[PDB]
Each structure stands twice: as structure tokens, then as C-alpha cells.
């Protein structure tokens, strides 16, 4: 199934988060060079353009059911979109570029990874639930455990950290 | 299944319904079409330098191509569908994982170097260690196996309760991560010992 967590546990600072494939494998989403996210099918047919961010989009993810898309931007926000292109929510609270984003397995929680050295957890109504503090540099990747109760973050500080939903730091994995 | 993106992030590959692999830029324009496979492509990988593409197919072959579309080699030797492909960190060795229960290792000039025999069911995934000397395979048989390049089996990592679909090494090469349909990720050392389970 989803390789985000393997990639966050073992991947490099340079791992690329601006392309995502839908869970059914039929749709590709790409953070494009024009402040949009574009969706296309495997034949190459353009399906949708997600317009709203005011600067570069760096991270994209699909919800586990494929119906919601999250985009992470240099504009310091995450935006949530329906696959028909409508903007559903803007998640405000990071203080710098947002590099990466992930959905929880149940689709109800969003995690974001920012240049501000934090991961933030959010619900779909756009409310901030938790801020995970401790990395000493920009956070480039984030993922959930398969049961959705542990969050993994990966940072330019060369560590991976494991956290629970109440913000407790469970483990730091060093040499990354 | 049948998608990849280049290490620099600027090229997206995807297997198409028509048995080709398409390469797109990040704006959804077509760059190249890789034509040659006679049935579905299940696995695509880019080499670390981003200059070579490997495709794994139901036609029992892996094809190697350059990024302007030219077929370079066809890797013939699996006896059933090839599900996964990986390149070694130096780009010189390719590993392929097949429904035939084997991993095969190949030079980028197409020669079969080794066949890694031991799994009792389909092999879904394969990875090289950062130093290129150890291969890990993830199988439907619920194990990850670790191998050297001479094809010798070094360890079998036992503990997942369902098929293992994904495997990778930590950046320092001393920890192996496995992901399974049992809804866990396990971390292991090279002596095959379980370090932790992530639910």
C-alpha cells in the first residue's frame, strides 16, 4: 500500500513530496511550476487544476479514499481540496514554508511538515490539534503509522522522530 | 504500482493502459513514451543518476531505457510476472522481484549475474543497502530475506503475519524497515533481530 512512512523512516532530505499518486493508482497529482496542483490520469488527460496558493506548492497528498487532496505551500498554508477542484479548507498556523503533508489512515487528521521546524496536526474543519516541537531544523517529511496513532517526522537535522497525537516525543532515530 | 518519479523530481513515469510507460514533466506535458513491453507494466524505477529507467512487466522481462525513450536492454530470465525493480546506489546493478519466487540481479548491460532462491511465494519488493553489497527482498511468504551479491542468503526476517510488500534500509545501512499487509512496520538489524514494531 502506501510508501510514505517507509520513505520518511529511511529517506533523504532531498526526497520529493510534490508528486502523489492516488490510492487506486489512476490519478497523478503534481505541484506544478505555476502555484497550482494539476491532476492527470495515466493516459495523460488533464483532469483538474487546483488554484488558490499564492506561491510555490511543494507537497501534495491524497486522502486514503482518494477524494481529498492536501497541498503544502511556500505561502505557509496547507489547503484541502475535493478531487473536483474546489477548495475546502485553508490550514493556517505554520510560520514558514510547508514542505510536506500526509493524511491519517482514517482520513480525518492531516499532518504537515514545515521550515518552521515543526509538524502540525489538523482536522478537516481546519482546526489545529497539536504542534510537534523538537526538531532543530526544517522538517521535510511526515507520515502516520498504519494504525494512525504514531506520527513519524524527518528533518534536515538528520533525525527521524516518532510522536503520539498528544505531542509526546516517543523516539528519535539518529543517522538520517 | 507502475509509477515513479526521478530523483531530481522533475520527471514522472507511469505505466499506461496501452503497455507503454509515459514520462511527464511536473506540468502534465508529455516528455517521452517508452514502447516495447507486450503486457502490463507493474514496476518502474529511475536510476540514482536519473538517466536510466527500468520497467518490470507481466511479460516476464525488465526493460532498461534512457530518458529520451530509447530501449537499451531487455532482461530475460524470469519465468513469470516481474513486480518490482531496483537499482544499486552506483546504478550498475539491477534487482528484479518476480512472481516466480526469485530475485534476479543483473548488470546494466543485460547480463544475468545471480538468481536469489529461497522465498516460497511471490517476491513483491527489493532494495539495495547504501553500500550496494546487501540486497533485501519482501515476499508474499511473510518474510524479508537479506542476501549478498554472490546470491547467498544471509538472514530471514520472520515475524510479520501477512505478506510483506515493502522494504528499505536506513541511511547508515544498519537497520532494515519492512512494511506488511498486517498493518505494521518492523525495524530489524542485520543479524535478523526485531528491534521494534510500529502499529
Amino acid at each position: 500500500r502506501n510508501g510514505q512512512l517507509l520513505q520518511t523512516l529511511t529517506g533523504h532530505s532531498s526526497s520529493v513530496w510534490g508528486v502523489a499518486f492516488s490510492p487506486d493508482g489512476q490519478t497523478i497529482a503534481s505541484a506544478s511550476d505555476d502555484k497550482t496542483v494539476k491532476l492527470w490520469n495515466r493516459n495523460g488527460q488533464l483532469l483538474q487544476t487546483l488554484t488558490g496558493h499564492s506561491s510555490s506548492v511543494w507537497g501534495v497528498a491524497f486522502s486514503p479514499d482518494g477524494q481529498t487532496i492536501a497541498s503544502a505551500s511556500d505561502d505557509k498554508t496547507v489547503k484541502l481540496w475535493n478531487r473536483n477542484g474546489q477548495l475546502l479548507q485553508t490550514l493556517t498556523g505554520h510560520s514558514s514554508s510547508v514542505w510536506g503533508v500526509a493524511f491519517s489512515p482514517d482520513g480525518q487528521t492531516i499532518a504537515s511538515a514545515s521550515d518552521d521546524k515543526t509538524v502540525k496536526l489538523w482536522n478537516r474543519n481546519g482546526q489545529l490539534l497539536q504542534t510537534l516541537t523538537g526538531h532543530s531544523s526544517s522538517v521535510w517529511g511526515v507520515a502516520f503509522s498504519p494504525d494512525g496513532q504514531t506520527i513519524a517526522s524527518a528533518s534536515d537535522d538528520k533525525t527521524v522522530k516518532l510522536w503520539n497525537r498528544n505531542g509526546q516525543l516517543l523516539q528519535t532515530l539518529t543517522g538520517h
Side-chain angles (χ1 to χ4, degrees), chain A residues 21-66:
Chain A
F21 305 100
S22 63
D24 72 357
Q26 302 310 307
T27 302
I28 298 138
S30 182
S32 290
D33 64 15
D34 64 356
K35 310 181 254 175
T36 71
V37 170
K38 292 181 209 303
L39 275 44
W40 64 94
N41 69 21
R42 292 192 165 211
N43 291 338
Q45 296 174 81
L46 179 67
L47 300 176
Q48 300 292 348
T49 299
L50 309 184
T51 303
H53 281 296
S54 59
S55 55
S56 304
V57 187
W58 308 119
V60 186
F62 286 94
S63 62
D65 71 7

Side-chain angles (χ1 to χ4, degrees), chain A residues 16-173:
Chain A
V16 175
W17 289 65
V19 180
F21 305 100
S22 63
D24 72 357
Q26 302 310 307
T27 302
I28 298 138
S30 182
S32 290
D33 64 15
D34 64 356
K35 310 181 254 175
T36 71
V37 170
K38 292 181 209 303
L39 275 44
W40 64 94
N41 69 21
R42 292 192 165 211
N43 291 338
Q45 296 174 81
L46 179 67
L47 300 176
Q48 300 292 348
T49 299
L50 309 184
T51 303
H53 281 296
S54 59
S55 55
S56 304
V57 187
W58 308 119
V60 186
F62 286 94
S63 62
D65 71 7
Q67 299 324 297
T68 305
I69 299 128
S71 58
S73 178
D74 218 54
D75 72 13
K76 317 174 182 180
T77 70
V78 168
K79 286 176 188 282
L80 307 178
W81 315 77
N82 73 22
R83 56 168 192 78
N84 79 1
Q86 279 155 16
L87 177 63
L88 300 177
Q89 301 289 164
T90 300
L91 283 40
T92 295
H94 286 298
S95 62
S96 195
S97 314
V98 189
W99 299 124
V101 64
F103 287 84
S104 67
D106 76 357
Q108 295 318 112
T109 304
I110 299 91
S112 53
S114 174
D115 192 59
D116 75 10
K117 313 180 173 78
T118 72
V119 162
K120 287 172 189 284
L121 306 182
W122 318 80
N123 72 17
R124 296 174 147 261
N125 42 50
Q127 290 172 298
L128 175 65
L129 305 173
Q130 194 56 65
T131 300
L132 309 173
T133 297
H135 281 296
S136 58
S137 301
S138 176
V139 187
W140 58 261
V142 63
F144 290 83
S145 68
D147 74 358
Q149 302 318 292
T150 304
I151 298 96
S153 60
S155 167
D156 296 352
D157 71 11
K158 316 190 61 48
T159 72
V160 170
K161 286 173 188 283
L162 304 185
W163 317 75
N164 68 21
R165 286 165 168 269
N166 76 359
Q168 199 197 320
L169 175 68
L170 299 179
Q171 194 181 348
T172 299
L173 295 81

